[PDB]
């Protein structure tokens, strides 16, 4: 059994306030021994230091482009802490194209990519490295526990819905654990998707089994 | 005194193969439109680069592998229009923002193809437009204009807010994206209105305006 | 036997009105199938695709030279097209220089090129590459069955010479199956070329044992 | 009348988190000092790379590696402040002096961050001005001035000979070695005198004027 | 009121050593018909590149990687004329031909070295010359001019019909398509003669003129 | 035992007046013999051509800076010499980073760089690689025997010093055989460096045993 993984770590999750040492310490060893049996990749987001640099940009009546590329330029500065951390398994620099990417996997490297460009996230960064990749799976380690009817951390009425297919996702969305373009790549490539929270990140080796209580995405 | 963004659709361009008088004209009246406002480009992929995409479909490339090669088109395609806007046209097509904004810098008229996958150029323009801060962005399609469906009907006038619903192709949703959150006044008009931009960008014509 | 070639696919037979799509997914498994021997490098042209490009760029009177940029930007278009036939056999993206695809070849990955630069062909291109790749053998897979006397779709009394040396290809390409510079290069170098039709191309692996009815030229 | 070059260490614009109403009064300063002077800008790291870098330090990261998180987080820092200096700054963070060169040209204030382990902005700020012979090096740090030690004493004058001794921090030795190397006259003020750039271009300052 | 582009041999730069005094004065000449002409540069290998290139023969490594030393040499080359043409020159050396234009726009005069093996800093004027659409290009090799052979004899004006003969070294005979396939007028002067640039572009001159 | 080594050959030891092919021809010899049993990576400077060069520039009062990229871009051309020599075990274009060079190592080939940034030498080059490749050791090829008490080309007492710790180093330096911030680099990682001239150069694998006349500069 060896399959090609894409993880989505949020950057919310990376870096809470400041850096949570703790976490990247601990899914750097999880995706390590992960990367033992499969081919590994890696995209994080920006996290509370790309809200802040961001927000700080608003006053200044910066365009929301340059905004965009403000938090691209933190996600990557955040990406340089987890390739810390994968220590000798990661590729050196943060990769800025997919194809960089695959060449990493090709050295038996891991890659971590930050964001890419304007308009979307790294979420949908990391649907398209899966799909570019053609990945069997993307792991989005968000800070919710799956996939909901509703905000979990706000509406009490919030159910977490274990399975559904990309169009489900795509509903959802709309009515956002994932944001929109990465749903539609999601679903135009019918990318198997799981999505799970800090907790269930302990244990990626469960987590790409199916053994999880996060949310299953696919066709 | 403005600040304009065209987007032209690729089967606008290249409906079949190119449009030879039609980039003619474009390209001359996007010279005078440019002796009086600051004048920047985005051109689409047409027919060719779905023949191409088809092609690499045969072979069962990835999705986004796909995007790279409309990309390579849309850009073969930028390269007449600047090959016709002669002197008046930065050299190179523009692959990021801000050169384009050197551009400008250098009164040229930058001429951009795609640039990532995932989206289209309306994104790429949108973002252009917002980029730049544009005062007008100019969606040139196949389409006469914003219509309630594919018996339809055209809305003269519509806010960002209501252009999000619509679209939920004529134009492609993060790009309406790009549009609402920003609030960029854009004009989309079809190939017969396109035939007289100088007009267009004062109001004189029948496609529609979006506006917050 | 272990050898190092380097395919110079012409662009009016990968692309003769259209993309030749029968052709594309046949030299394709071709070329995988050489692959697995040895040491497999690509060069492809423009085309009708490319003359019909630069033909509009001559009514608005542009120069020489973006006429060549735009060629050389129609060959990648074409290239990624061999790429896509070439599956998880290919380097992911057009090499746009030398030392790029010695690269791909150390990552046993098959480089595909379109052009580089003005004033040449990917003829030239394909010279330089084997030159610089320092390979056994170029193959000039055209539009005519090998080097004739004169123009055979033309001139009735061309006559095809099975073999000559390199100042012989330089005559002829003087008096072309093959452009000046490559002509030079091949000659500089004394690179062993072979140039065959679709025809032979059906099967390289009888090709580069010298079982074919192109011209094979060498020192 | 002059072409300067300001080195803004991180610590001032970002002592803890960047500081807004600074970071805007610095940003309109440096407008109007360019109104009538050529200027070009180097942001450090302050605070926030060092969080980042014991981050990695944690991980063992080489220093190499470490100077790279460092050098990524300067270039953070310039974007706030280029979106400060809004329409009249150079877009994108220069990361190499003929790009700085290249806004100059243009007539746009060039922000640059780090560029190579081994050093500081400080010595980046140093080449710059070497590089694009400034007339005036500004370097604003978290101290009032030079001083004879961290009862020290604050030095008025001095010249670049005197400044190599010194620093064997307040300023790195590479960006000494390049002051004294080329003899570029070199102003040292604190965040106080940062608060009226038109006069301490001026010699109305109470910090450190470095001169052969 | 023209555009020129010159291309000064590596023997002439570079005899033995780089010529000190001749470098100062075609520099001093460049800069004067800038301020009349836009002007270019591409400047070639010399004696050094032979000898750099011998020594990897001897190693024998492959024609295309001597091709890139040769190319190295030659950037190394222009930035001795860089250095001289002080503020007038674009910084850096250029490496493709839209680069030399952004450098025109600037009113700085960009200096070019080789650019792809195969060919030789002919074909990169000769080229260059085409993109630029120059009205002129100046040849300054190491011979008086074009003759009927390596007792030769010297022909004032030939078509570039003819030079393609000739050609079957003086010039590199893809920089002889390049001005052919196009028409570039183009001036073959030696050394003596380059030691007046402005007069010698103005027809006085005892070297060779290749016109349509 | 498989170590990891970078070798910055001084450029004046291999530029004395033109290229000293000799040299250049043995060393790569020994560094493709050193490079069977370790991970080799080389710097290379600038020697006579670049202070010529310089010296041209000087006489046009260009800036300090300009001059040093000219002499950068003249340990490129001395850098290509190398690579010509080392062959087919070389990485085939002059390395400007060091990811780069990091790359080159996991292709199983040989880097060699020049200079990379204005404000230092060759030797910082060396010492930053060998401290981003975490390299056991560097060795340092000049036209001196080792480390010594003052010039041993010109005073009389200059005595050498077999050991010394990089506080050592930074001292003698200070009051020269090692630039400065290169120095700096090896006292502040602890970089194992080895100080020898021509004559122990002949035998690298002697040399990375210990057995050398040269300096050893350790923690
Ligand atoms: O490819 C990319 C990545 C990131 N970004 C920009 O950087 C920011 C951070 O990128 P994230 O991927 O972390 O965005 P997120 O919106 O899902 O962030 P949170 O709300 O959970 O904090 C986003 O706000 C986006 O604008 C891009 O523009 N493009
Ligand atoms: O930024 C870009 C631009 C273009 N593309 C890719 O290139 C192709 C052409 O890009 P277009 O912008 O022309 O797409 P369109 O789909 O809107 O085209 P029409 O249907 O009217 O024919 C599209 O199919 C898209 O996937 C990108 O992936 N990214
Ligand atoms: O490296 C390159 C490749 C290609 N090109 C430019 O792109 C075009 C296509 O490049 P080809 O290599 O297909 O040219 P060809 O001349 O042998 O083409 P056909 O006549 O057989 O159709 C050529 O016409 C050339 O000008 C370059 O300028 N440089
Ligand atoms: O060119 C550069 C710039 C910066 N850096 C790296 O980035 C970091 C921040 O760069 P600074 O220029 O802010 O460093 P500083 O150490 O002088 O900072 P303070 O102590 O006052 O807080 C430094 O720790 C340095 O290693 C480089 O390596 N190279
Ligand atoms: O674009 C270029 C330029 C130069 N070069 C390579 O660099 C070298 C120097 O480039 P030159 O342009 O000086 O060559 P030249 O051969 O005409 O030189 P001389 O004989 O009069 O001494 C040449 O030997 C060539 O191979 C290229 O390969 N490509
Ligand atoms: O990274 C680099 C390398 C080199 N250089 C520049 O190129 C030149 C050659 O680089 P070297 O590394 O050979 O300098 P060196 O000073 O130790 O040279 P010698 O005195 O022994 O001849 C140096 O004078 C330096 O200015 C840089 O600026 N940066």
Same mark, same amino acid.
């Given at each position: #059994?060896?399959?090609?993984?894409?993880?989505?770590?949020?950057? #919310?999750?990376?870096?809470?306030?400041?850096? %949570?040492? %703790?976490?990247?310490?601990?899914?750097?060893?999880?995706?390590?021994?992960?990367? @033992?049996?499969? @081919?590994?990749?890696?995209?994080?987001?920006?996290?509370?230091?790309?809200?802040?640099?961001?927000?700080?940009?608003?006053?200044?009546?910066?365009?929301? *482009?340059?905004?965009?590329?403000?938090?691209?330029?933190?996600?990557?500065?955040?990406?340089?802490?987890?390739?810390?951390? &994968?220590? @000798?398994?990661?590729?050196?620099?943060?990769? @800025?194209?997919?194809?960089?990417?695959?060449?990493?996997?090709?050295?038996?490297?891991?890659?971590?990519?930050?964001?890419?460009?304007?308009?979307?996230? *790294?979420?949908?960064?990391?649907?398209?490295?899966?799909?570019?990749?053609?990945?069997? &799976?993307?792991?989005?380690?968000?800070?919710?526990?799956?996939?909901?009817?509703?905000?979990?951390?706000?509406?009490?009425?919030?159910?977490?819905?274990?399975?559904?297919? !990309?169009?489900?996702?795509?509903?959802?969305?709309?009515? #956002?654990?994932?944001?929109?373009?990465?749903?539609?790549?999601?679903?135009?490539?019918?990318?198997?998707?799981?999505?799970?929270?800090?907790?269930?990140?302990?244990? &990626?080796?469960?987590?790409?089994?199916?053994?999880?209580?996060?949310?299953?995405?696919? !066709?």
């Amino acid at each position: #059994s060896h399959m090609r993984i894409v993880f989505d770590i949020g950057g #919310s999750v990376l870096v809470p306030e400041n850096p %949570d040492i %703790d976490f990247i310490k601990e899914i750097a060893y999880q995706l390590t021994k992960v990367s @033992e049996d499969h @081919e590994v990749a890696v995209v994080v987001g920006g996290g509370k230091l790309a809200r802040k640099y961001i927000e700080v940009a608003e006053k200044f009546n910066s365009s929301e *482009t340059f905004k965009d590329f403000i938090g691209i330029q933190i996600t990557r500065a955040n990406a340089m802490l987890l390739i810390a951390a &994968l220590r @000798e398994k990661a590729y050196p620099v943060v990769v @800025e194209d997919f194809w960089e990417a695959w060449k990493a996997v090709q050295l038996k490297k891991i890659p971590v990519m930050g964001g890419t460009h304007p308009g979307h996230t *790294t979420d949908a960064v990391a649907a398209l490295l899966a799909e570019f990749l053609k990945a069997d &799976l993307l792991v989005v380690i968000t800070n919710v526990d799956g996939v909901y009817t509703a905000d979990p951390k706000k509406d009490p009425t919030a159910k977490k819905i274990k399975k559904m297919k !990309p169009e489900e996702l795509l509903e959802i969305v709309g009515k #956002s654990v994932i944001d929109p373009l990465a749903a539609k790549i999601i679903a135009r490539t019918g990318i198997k998707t799981i999505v799970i929270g800090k907790e269930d990140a302990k244990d &990626l080796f469960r987590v790409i089994k199916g053994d999880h209580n996060g949310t299953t995405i696919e !066709p």
